[PDB]
């Protein structure tokens, strides 16, 4: 939570400086009892440190004097020792592309094998391989005088996302026996409630 843990409002770019960055808890969703949270998962991430930087501001944690020698100026404040790198996603290539491909679910990771309870289906997707930003600019004069000055042009940054979801569903029967149905009741009472 960059908004709550960084009162500086200046440690990370404007994208996240007042937002929350979430990472999927694959460990928790895979250890789920029923496996409804996630029965199909594809991850592919990459990053490296492009530039190394220093953070200004008083160091809240005292650098232990056992780890360095101060030099001749025995009353010298040690420089800032909070290092933060600039991340980078390296090359974006269509060989590493993960979408525009058909994926067939046969065996799920959990016990729920792709069954859409309550006739709904949640699709979470992140794709940062199309992060290009359009820069649109408009002249401040009704028609531009053929001389460029930054004050006579307004600059705007716009971003675009485009999707096309496709699905193949299979119709299924559930014989409402005893033992069963009571198991469904212990699973989700609202399942029987929405049926009859």
């Amino acid at each position, epitope marked *: 939570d960059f908004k709550l843990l960084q009162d500086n409002k200046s440690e990370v770019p404007l994208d996240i400086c007042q937002s929350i960055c979430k990472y999927p808890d694959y460990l928790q969703m895979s250890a789920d009892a029923y496996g409804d949270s996630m029965f199909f998962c594809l991850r592919r991430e990459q990053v490296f440190a492009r530039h190394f930087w220093n953070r200004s501001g*008083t160091m809240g944690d005292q650098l232990p*004097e056992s780890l360095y020698i101060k030099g001749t100026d025995i009353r010298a404040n040690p420089g800032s020792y909070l290092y933060s790198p600039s991340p980078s996603g390296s090359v974006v290539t269509s060989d590493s592309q993960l979408f525009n491909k058909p994926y067939w679910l046969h065996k799920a990771q959990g016990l729920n094998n792709g069954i859409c309870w309550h006739n709904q289906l949640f699709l979470t997707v992140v794709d940062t391989t199309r992060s290009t930003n359009l820069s649109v600019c408009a002249s401040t004069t009704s028609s531009i005088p053929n001389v460029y000055t930054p004050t006579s042009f307004k600059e705007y940054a716009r971003h675009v996302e485009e999707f096309d979801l496709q699905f193949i569903f299979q119709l299924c029967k559930i014989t409402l026996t005893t033992e069963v149905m009571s198991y469904i009741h212990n699973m989700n009472t609202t399942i029987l409630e929405d049926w009859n």
Partner: antibody
Amino acid sequence: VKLVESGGGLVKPGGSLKLSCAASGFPFSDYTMSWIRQTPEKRLEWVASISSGGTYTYYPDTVKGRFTISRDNAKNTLYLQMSSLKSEDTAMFYCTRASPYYDYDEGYMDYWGQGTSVTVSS
Amino acid sequence: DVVMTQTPLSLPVSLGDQASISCRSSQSLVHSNGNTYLHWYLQKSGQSPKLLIYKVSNRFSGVPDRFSGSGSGTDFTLKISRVEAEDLGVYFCSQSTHVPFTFGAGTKLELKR
């Protein structure tokens, strides 16, 4: 905030003596400490100073061999180990707090103790 | 090493008047660093000294607006706008720019009667 000097008495010349100082109300291990004495003629002199961690100490040349400042950050205590004192070192010894670790040792002592007078004479 | 000279050693004044204590050093007192490290302390009778001004012109926490430090290089001054009852004591002038940290010699702010 409390800086309390203590220890130990008025002792013979050429003998040792240990001075203690208990701190309260602030992160003791975060500040550089110092000893400042006031002569019987009521003039103030700088005696010693030790870093936030007990690794860096410095004194004037007038006390280079006799005094040894130390500190226990776990006990929040400051110590001045005086040895082979002469009668000219008679003074009211004050335990003072300087700048924190994240500042250059600016050398101003904002908080002073109550003082412990030691005198050395035959 | 460095010597501190205060003028005068005894400054008798009446309440409500202005007070001025001078302090001169033998060396430049300007550090090989941003600021100049000259300070003013106040000691009252039988009470440990207490910090009054740090770094030539910065009032310590809880110091009234009447106290005003000024100066640079080797010439420094301390001005009290309206001398009050609880301002009487020895004023010390310290330098910590150069090792050893040195200060003298005591300036008695006494009452005029």
